[PDB]
Amino acid sequence: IPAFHPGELNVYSAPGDVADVSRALRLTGRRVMLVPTMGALHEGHLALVRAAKRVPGSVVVVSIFVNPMQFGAGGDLDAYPRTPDDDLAQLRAEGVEIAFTPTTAAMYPDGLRTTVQPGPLAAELEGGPRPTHFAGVLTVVLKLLQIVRPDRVFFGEKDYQQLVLIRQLVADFNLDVAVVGVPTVREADGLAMSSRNRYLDPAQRAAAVALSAALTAAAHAATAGAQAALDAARAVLDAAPGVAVDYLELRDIGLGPMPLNGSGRLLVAARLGTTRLLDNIAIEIGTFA
Amino acid sequence: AIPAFHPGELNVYSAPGDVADVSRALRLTGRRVMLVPTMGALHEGHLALVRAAKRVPGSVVVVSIFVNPMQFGALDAYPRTPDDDLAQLRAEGVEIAFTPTTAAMYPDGLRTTVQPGPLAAELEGGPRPTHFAGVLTVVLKLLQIVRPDRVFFGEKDYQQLVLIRQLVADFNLDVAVVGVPTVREADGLAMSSRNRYLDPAQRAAAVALSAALTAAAHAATAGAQAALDAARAVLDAAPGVAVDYLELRDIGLGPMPLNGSGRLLVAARLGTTRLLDNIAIEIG
Ligand SMILES: Nc1ncnc2c1ncn2[C@@H]1O[C@H](COP(=O)(O)CP(=O)(O)OP(=O)(O)O)[C@@H](O)[C@H]1O
Ligand SMILES: Nc1ncnc2c1ncn2[C@@H]1O[C@H](COP(=O)(O)CP(=O)(O)OP(=O)(O)O)[C@@H](O)[C@H]1O
Ligand SMILES: [Mg+2]
Ligand SMILES: [Mg+2]
């Protein structure tokens, strides 16, 4: 129904409009790629966009929606950064053909009625301080997937637990979509890019390099075992000024009811002032490579 | 390589991936996929759903047969007649039967699930608080596996039908939900596999549910209270019928409007057998 100008950025706010356009495109043979974001786009988001872009004959749909359901009480929702103008400009510069920018009313016309209940993983790690956070994420992603019906959906490895939960959602509900995890984009010194980084002042920005330095040190110390790996990361974090560690955990790659055996993920969350930063890295125990 | 599909014949698939591939292939050939979810032990009521699906032009009918463990209260006793069920489908001209195992549907146990809205805790949700989460979770999965153009459910389980409409709207599902009128025995009793459990006196008293509903529907020209009182009087004239609820709601099961369309629902226990029924009501 709505107009679609190829080669140009087409912005649709109505779920029905992007649904009709996606369907039409899909019918002509083009493969639909979906990159779900909450706006305030930076180089990390662009890596996802570029990963989607390189899929042969694909049309990229980037959704921008600050999902109220994944925010807990507080001014977290009001505090989330919003920079619409820069966002669309960057999408246009990346050659993205579709931006989906829905209203809260169009996504939640009936408030929170039917929702997604994540499995046990949602209550741990990031879910500890926010028991309802991932139910909000999976509910909106399921909706986005039903609206856009993409062949592949892209998520960053930076938010590893979120990526694992999306894989669980897709597997558990038999969703016909491929989940593509994209490697974390980092600043020159290793800091994982994140919109929350804008809240780090000069001193905090300097100290924040400790998360990634700790993780990479652990990844290399891992030839000596799990204890060596964790102790190396702890030492780096402990030597960092003003870094308060929330958690530092080594888990199996699925983060589930499975012990660590050889391959794993080391995850860290720490507070620098009021800014909570996260990072994670692949870990191989007893492997020199 | 797409699994084999023989047109005009009943094709049975147990693997979710197989029916998924066949459904996708058929949709591309210009067929409209119709889904009729069941738990087997098929009777005339189920056949009405099948016939509703069959009459859609270009239809290819998929009937799923899966005893869903998640919708059973805190399973083995449930009746299972594979051969006879399949025979009825073949006689109806159904081309696809999807018969997955529990392990195939829940390869990871109960992990991610559907949390229904608050309507799921009312009416039937009173005695079985987790029943509808089970129903919506398995229906979402079946919809994703089969990707039908339309899905059919009987009006007999009206609350179930309404919650599935909520599921579809809330998750932006691209499928039409079709409610099919309740098939009834000669005296009005809603057909149900559990009716066989009623002894003679119970089966005779059971006519009270449908008689109470139809009486209420006609009494409705006199108002909502008149409709409710008429239904209660009919249920009150029957022995051994323990009414759990008799409620008049709007068609989406919210509060009944001053006037207009509504739905009257009843549930009662006769011995150890629980029966339910419901009917459209027009107030005034
Ligand atoms: N540095 C990075 N490298 C790769 N992917 C990244 C990334 N930063 C974010 N992403 C991915 O981009 C997607 C959208 O992220 P958002 O949820 O919009 C917030 P954010 O960009 O992660 O920052 P914030 O939580 O600090 O505000 C997610 O799938 C996320 O994992
Ligand atoms: N008499 C009837 N008329 C129309 N649809 C009916 C019906 N009885 C059942 N159905 C529909 O058939 C589908 C399968 O439901 P089932 O529970 O598996 C059969 P059932 O007869 O309701 O068994 P039950 O007595 O164990 O509850 C549902 O969509 C249900 O509403
Ligand atoms: Mg983030
Ligand atoms: Mg039933």
Curated annotation (Swiss-Prot), chain B:
Its main location: cytoplasm. ATP binds at residues 39-46, 154-157, 183, 191-194. Mg(2+) binds at residues 84-85, 88. Changing residue 46 to A: More than 1000-fold reduction in activity and 60-fold decrease in adenylate formation. 10-fold decrease in the affinity for ATP. Belongs to the pantothenate synthetase family. Catalyzes the condensation of pantoate with beta-alanine in an ATP-dependent reaction via a pantoyl-adenylate intermediate. This is Pantothenate synthetase. The lineage of its organism: Bacteria, Bacillati, Actinomycetota, Actinomycetes, Mycobacteriales. The gene is panC.
